[PDB]
Write a protein that binds this ligand. Sequence first.
Ligand SMILES: [Zn+2]
Length: 257
Amino acid sequence: HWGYGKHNGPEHWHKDFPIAKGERQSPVDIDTHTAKYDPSLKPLSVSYDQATSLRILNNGHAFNVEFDDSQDKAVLKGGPLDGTYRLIQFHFHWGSLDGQGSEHTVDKKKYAAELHLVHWNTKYGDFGKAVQQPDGLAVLGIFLKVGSAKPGLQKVVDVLDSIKTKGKSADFTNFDPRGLLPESLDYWTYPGSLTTPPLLECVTWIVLKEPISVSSEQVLKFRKLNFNGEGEPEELMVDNWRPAQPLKNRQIKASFK
Ligand SMILES: [Zn+2]
């Protein structure tokens, strides 16, 4: 029964998930001045040409676009990563207003939303095993600002009416996640966690410097989703973001000067 309400939101999670107060929690504020350029970081390799999207699901906290991860079809390699990480799903976090919604912040700036492309390390065989390992996941985080529309997002926006409430799913084949990537793959990276319960400390975060732009109409459609099930009282799915957590004994590295 965790969520984003007054009574069950991020400040309460630690009671069921004590790792909430752990040493490598996410998100964090990215202080651009203090991040260190690491000239030995490699370019990211994003290989999404063979991606197979399957379905979109409202899970009561966000919506997930799920992929076939039973073969190396859509993978992330390079950068800070050793080995091959398969895309399993992406989802967003967003606000009730354009001035909030992201999980990571940049010099304390909040974006309207944040996209998370979630990948797991193939050496661990499946996602459930990967989340038990300190190098199990790689999450590509991309900020959204409101401005021009993102054409490559529109297919997602259009299906949202069919998954308004918790537990609803819809077929979602042939969606190309390359259409959600900014021009530049410059990034920050640090070791962290899932940003929802169970908050496991299994993620290498790769946060892109360059935001993508989406339109006010597109983000409005996100805000018409519901946290609740059909036939339950309507609560808009907004402000499904965890705030910045203490950096503790971590250094954020930059791939760029
Ligand atoms: Zn997320």
